[PDB]
Design a protein around this ligand. Structure first.
Ligand SMILES: CCCCCCCCCCCCCCCCCC(=O)OC[C@H](CO)OC(=O)CCCCCCCCCCCCCCCCC
Ligand SMILES: CCCCCCCCCCCCCCCCCC(=O)OC[C@H](CO)OC(=O)CCCCCCCCCCCCCCCCC
Ligand SMILES: CCCCCCCCCCCCCCCCCC(=O)OC[C@H](CO)OC(=O)CCCCCCCCCCCCCCCCC
Ligand SMILES: CCCCCCCCCCCCCCCCCC(=O)OC[C@H](CO)OC(=O)CCCCCCCCCCCCCCCCC
Ligand SMILES: CCCCCC[N+](CCCCCC)(CCCCCC)CCCCCC
Ligand SMILES: CCCCCCCCCO
Ligand SMILES: CCCCCCCCCO
Ligand SMILES: CCCCCCCCCO
Ligand SMILES: CCCCCCCCCO
Ligand SMILES: c1ccc2[nH]ccc2c1
Ligand SMILES: c1ccc2[nH]ccc2c1
Ligand SMILES: c1ccc2[nH]ccc2c1
Ligand SMILES: c1ccc2[nH]ccc2c1
Lengths: 219, 212, 212, 219, 219, 212, 212, 219
């Protein structure tokens, strides 16, 4: 099962402050350490700090400005990082991981995309992309769906809620006037469409949406 | 604190070749190095611990070696699923530290794009905007040009493009080009074409649709 | 004996930026490094001890980090009171040793001088000498020219100038130019002017007084 | 209170010899070390030696010509550095500092400016600088006073004996034909002058002077 | 006596797998280690692994792709290296050597030339080279014999099965269309030929040949 | 793992000179270095162990020295039997490791080749092929040219050459050039000559035989 | 074995200046360095032991300092008797080792030679040979030219010169030029002159004697 | 007194072999080591080996060709170095020195100049150099004497057997057709010559000479 559970997302205003959570399952020892690791986009991994829950002792990277304060609820197996007084510098995916006290990170969360913006949450508009009747075809057909006008990042996009994985491209969002936008491609054999249904599922954790959208041909 | 240097920063290699990633430490750390893999938007995944010890789940293609200040991660016969960033990390002395990372890139055979043009949806139009999407898909090498022409005349306003990193299914690249106007402006034209220019052909691959 | 190298020797930075000073040792010294601050004519003041341990009195802007041979002093958001030389020092092995030092310099907004010309005092004249003083005050950047003219005609004899280092109240610079003659020679002229030429204006700022 | 007390100044002739003093207050331990540190002008700090008073054992920097001999009177809490047979090389501010045997210098004296010269002590002449009646004014006014014909360095200059600190510039002395000279600026609101008094106090420790000088307008 | 005995040769097909043997004589201790060392042609020595027979614990070079698996029969004093799934990379002379647990290789085998080829074993054709009747002579005469059309390497070539060693040149084989070929020279005093017999002996271990060939003058 | 660097890679020296081979380790290894000798197609042979300890069998010409990271193998008065590759190897830390090797080469006096041409054997001809062999023997320096002429006319088809490495009997070099035709083609010519061009003479040394 | 590097190899300095000689070791050796002095044809003399410990006999001008890998010998106010080679040597690890040495050279005021020409002795002539000796003495700087003229005509045969190293009495240099002929050849000329050309004068200093 | 006594000189033929001696006085301990050090001309010092006499254990520099064999007669306090099979490489001054087992060389011999030559010992001819009657003079006068036709090196030259030391220059020998030659200068006040006698003493240890020679004016 998923050993470490973190929120997909958090938006924060400049000078404001956020509390990330990291919940754990599987074998818990009192000798276990939870670590937090920051990754700014298109950058590397940066150790921030660690805590040992069965106590509450925590240590921090001294080589960076100290934004963090770590804590744990030993009852609910949850670790928390208080990130306080953030700036745009502080925007990043923050992972948590678990180390059994023997120095490596066996297991990691999926991480929380933290966006520091004055701007406002906006759910995404989703729209099919079936091809025009003029377009001829091969032994394969390419369908797709277009996620736009959203903020903050991220979104995840699936094809038939996991079952369709071979043949899928999601592109990076592009930001313009404070709304991200992207598209996702999928390619099935033409003989499997539209008899066999094809649907793009789209999660946006910052507004807690998750909308399906079927791709039918054009009327 | 221990500095971990990873060279080179980018490592291009051919399918099936043996490949090797370096990680040099700023002082002797025994074999307390561990190597991680992070795919595009993945989280990291432990591959090798204590410099050479296998993990379960991990293809035997992956091994590690070294001790002291010089460590190597090696992959016997690279393949598409290996396209990722590779990090090293030390537990020899506090604080734990990470290397700056190395990206693996596979040189594959040349491939021409598969182009697909997409009209706006009637759903979208309702709300008072119109975006036409072209997908330039599964080509190699990464460099490509997309041209938009409206009713025979090239347009440059309102276009956003996005390119995927190399793909772990087939070492190819892909691109989406998105043309965005109002309903007003989409209404007063007939023919949209996305043209694509790529090493693999002297003739562009062009794809068009008409509203009428 | 342990050599402590500080780079760079001069560190120019913008108000409010995070700044970092380096101190490398010639062999591994744990965390037995300590950092001191010395303002213009101040004595030194301990800022950080054992590489990262806070001292009471010291703004939390100041932190330190490192161990082994590489140490860093950092200031979160620099500000005018930080203008100083910064030294590192080791207690790991005898004798204790100091680094050669790094000066912090803040690039601020441009500012034009405030000029002020001063006649001799009647006290001074009594004793048989006369000095006229011009103050070129609170300007940025440091480069400036002062010209003396007597009765419309530039004089170069008998002038001494002195420039202050950057100022911890406002990161500006200042200058004093002092023109010294006998009573005899001061008596046989009417009009003294100190002229000042500075980046901030194409026109010089000029200041004059007449004895008659 | 001021933990370490050193003379402002000492003049010495080439080949002559001087005894600097460093007196201590606050918590004294028998495990305490007093250090001496030399700083030539526009240069760095140079460790010279150390002594532990509750004993009299002293060690010296071996990397330099040995000018120093350290001693202490454990009764009067004073440490002494005998600098002997000096040259102009040896002209410098010498600090003393105190280290609790744990390797850092918590506390420092203000240091003694030692000048090695054939030349002769000369107290300073002080003279106002109020502005001429022709000069117009802002919401602030700049007054100043001019310290000249002195030797050796240094002098300190205050404005209303400490109370006026915001708005003050003292310039570096310039030496010409064996007398230093400098000026000090101060800037108050024009509406506070001359109703509210403004006075430059000036200490020259090598001749033990200390003269006030009020700044009135010009008759 | 010859302390370590290895086959001269083994041919293997791509993807196939071979078992090399290394048999030992002389003083055997239970504290002895047998090592294997690879040398690709015109390259250096590369440590592959070691085993201690009186146990069966074996260690391998971690810095290379692991082709090897080591074992021993403590009864027959033989060590074995299983080289598995070879490619042309893996073609090389593999030595075994013996180390008494004190870190150096006192004694080495002669090594096994391992060739990884799709091609087929071919014994060698041997042919004299006596000089033509037109050729005049010195106080020395040069005879020789020509080993050709063989595969795989190697061959050894002797002159009167060891007794003739001064004056002998064997040249490196050259490969063309999957058969190696070479020649070997010998130079005796002219007055010792052909009264005193002269014969080239030629071993090709991959086909287990070993043919003599006398060198008479030309009829 | 310990890196052992051997410089230089090739070492040319004159007969009887004292010669020295270097082996530098990537960290301090006491005196746990051992030196081996490998002649052309020989297996290796231990020469010196623990950096300086003699072995029995080995001429006292050979000694070793060094400790820490710098080691030297030396030969007092080099001679022909010394022509070989020389390797170093460490046992200080696991795994054992070898240096990349140094080849010894002796510069000797110039010597002209001894040429010898050889008709095919009647044994060979039987099977339907014919190879004529020229030996260019015991010359110095290694550079030499062999020319084949058939009935006065230079031929280039069907020739294979092979050169020996320097020879441990006399520091000379040797070469074999082998001309291979069918019986058919060997039958329709009379005169074969192997010509040899070498520094030692302006005139080529030429050797010929006729079938008729 | 421990390598001891001495820089610079030659150290020119002015009378009375403080001078410093460096000795760097190839690994950390505590303070087990010792410094020796060797004058021209002297044997060596211990100056400083264990890096800084005085020896009795040695002027207090001499001190030493350093520990680990960097050591310094210093002389407060150099003077003529200090002209020598200076060696360092380590006892930290076997075998003991010496540095390659540094020569001290004092730049002094310019001085012109004192020339002196010397006829053969009657003792010498007896045995059937004749040598005339010119001494070019106590000059600075070392470069100088000596010319021989016989009866107005420059001779170059039969002349041997020898130059002293810098002199520990006065930092000057000296030179002897010796002209050697048979009695036969010395007999058939009248006037020998040794001419000397030196920076200090545009006119040569010339010295002559006549047999008649 | 002179703690360590070595011969001035030894000549040896190529392939021949010599035994140098080093005799000791002053405090002898059984814990004392005698060292030998080689200095080729215009080169540095090179440690050769050491012995501890009160035992006979000796160690040698392994970084050089081993010419030496050390021994001692504990009875006569003498140490010996057997230099065997020498070449011209081996020509040099060899010192001995004594180290009390604490790593430095307190005390050194004067060293033995060892010359390896086919050539033959030749005592030196000595000849005055008083000035010609034409030569005028200062407040000082320069006399000298000329040592020639000798082999091997060295010679020492004194002026009144030690008493005259201020004002003396001995020049380096120059070698021509297998005989060294040199001169030595001396400079006294002119008023002290020739009333006060002036004499050059000249030792050549390889032939065991030592000849005085007075310097009178010219008849
Ligand atoms: C009894 C004495 C033997 C000590 C062996 C130490 C293991 C060393 C190792 O290099 O082990 C190597 C290996 C890593 O590859 O670790 C392992 O699996 C070895 C597991 C060993 C021990 C378990 C951990 C003990 C935890 C003590 C703290 C208890 C409260 C928390
Ligand atoms: C009982 C055994 C435990 C010894 C702890 C040593 C402190 C180490 C430290 O790294 O301490 C770290 C810390 C520095 O950050 O120092 C501190 O505050 C720690 C204070 C500890 C001890 C006080 C000093 C003892 C003085 C002995 C000499 C007495 C006569 C003079
Ligand atoms: C009793 C205590 C003395 C221990 C001496 C260790 C030898 C060190 C050496 O540096 O020795 C130096 C020397 C190498 O030059 O080795 C040698 O010859 C020395 C031989 C010494 C010992 C023999 C090996 C013991 C084997 C133990 C394992 C038994 C089962 C296998
Ligand atoms: C009782 C235990 C104390 C041991 C002190 C060791 C001296 C260390 C030193 O760093 O000493 C420093 C100092 C060098 O500067 O040496 C010296 O003067 C110190 C002299 C000390 C000892 C004399 C030498 C003992 C000889 C033993 C071998 C006897 C048979 C030969
Ligand atoms: C390799 C040095 C040999 C000395 C063995 C004892 N050490 C343990 C203490 C470690 C000190 C910090 C390295 C070193 C003690 C002597 C100090 C000289 C370095 C060896 C510990 C293993 C680390 C060696 C580098
Ligand atoms: C004997 C006392 C042991 C206490 C260890 C706890 C460490 C606390 C860390 O700051
Ligand atoms: C057992 C003897 C201890 C004496 C320690 C005092 C150190 C004096 C320093 O020179
Ligand atoms: C006390 C247990 C000792 C066992 C040692 C055997 C080592 C096995 C290697 O993998
Ligand atoms: C217990 C045995 C001690 C013997 C030490 C003597 C060393 C001899 C050197 O080769
Ligand atoms: C990816 C590929 C091509 C590109 N040209 C300009 C930006 C950019 C990014
Ligand atoms: C400070 C500023 C400007 C200057 N120009 C010449 C000296 C000097 C010092
Ligand atoms: C050895 C000698 C000469 C050569 N010329 C071309 C290859 C080659 C090899
Ligand atoms: C010393 C001084 C000058 C010289 N010119 C040529 C050799 C030589 C030696």
């Amino acid at each position: 099962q998923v050993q470490l559970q973190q929120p997909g997302a958090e938006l924060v205003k400049p000078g404001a402050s956020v509390k990330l959570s990291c919940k754990a399952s599987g074998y818990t020892f009192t000798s276990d350490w939870i670590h937090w690791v920051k990754q700014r986009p298109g950058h590397g991994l940066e150790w921030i700090g660690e805590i040992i829950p069965s106590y509450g002792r925590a240590n921090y990277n001294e080589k960076i400005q100290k934004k963090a304060t770590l804590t744990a609820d030993k009852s609910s197996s949850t670790a928390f990082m208080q990130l306080s007084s953030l700036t745009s510098e502080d925007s990043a995916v923050y992972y948590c991981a678990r180390e059994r006290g023997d120095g490596y990170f066996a297991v990691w969360g999926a991480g929380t995309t933290v966006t520091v913006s004055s701007a406002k949450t906006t759910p995404p508009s989703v729209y099919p992309l079936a091809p025009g009747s003029a377009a001829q075809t091969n032994s394969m057909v390419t369908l797709g769906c277009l996620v736009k006008g959203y903020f903050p990042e991220p979104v995840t996009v699936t094809w038939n809620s996991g079952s369709l994985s071979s043949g899928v491209h999601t592109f990076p969002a592009v930001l313009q006037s404070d709304l991200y936008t992207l598209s996702s491609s999928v390619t099935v054999p033409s003989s499997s469409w539209p008899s066999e249904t094809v649907t793009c599922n789209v999660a946006h954790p910052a507004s807690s949406t998750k909308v399906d959208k079927k791709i039918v041909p054009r009327d | 604190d221990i500095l971990l240097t990873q060279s080179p920063a980018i490592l291009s290699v051919s399918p099936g070749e043996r490949v090797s990633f370096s990680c040099r430490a700023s002082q002797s750390i025994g074999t307390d190095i561990h190597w991680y893999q992070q795919r595009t938007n993945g989280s990291p995944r432990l591959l090798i611990k204590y410099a050479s010890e296998s993990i379960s789940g991990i293809p035997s293609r992956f091994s590690g070696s070294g001790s002291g200040t010089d460590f190597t991660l090696s992959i016997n016969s690279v393949e598409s699923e290996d396209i990722a960033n590779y990090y090293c990390q030390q537990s020899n002395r506090w604080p734990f530290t990470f290397g700056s990372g190395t990206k693996l890139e596979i040189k594959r055979a040349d491939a021409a794009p598969t182009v697909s043009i997409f009209p706006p949806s009637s759903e979208q139009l309702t709300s008072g905007g119109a975006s036409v999407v072209c997908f330039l898909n599964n080509f190699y090498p990464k460099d490509i040009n997309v041209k938009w022409k409206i009713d025979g005349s090239e347009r440059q306003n309102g276009v956003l493009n996005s390119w995927t990193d190399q793909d772990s299914k087939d070492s190819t690249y892909s691109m989406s080009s998105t043309l965005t106007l109002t309903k007003d402006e989409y209404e007063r034209h007939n023919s949209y074409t996305c043209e694509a220019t790529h090493k693999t052909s002297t003739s562009p691959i062009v794809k068009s649709f008409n509203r009428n």
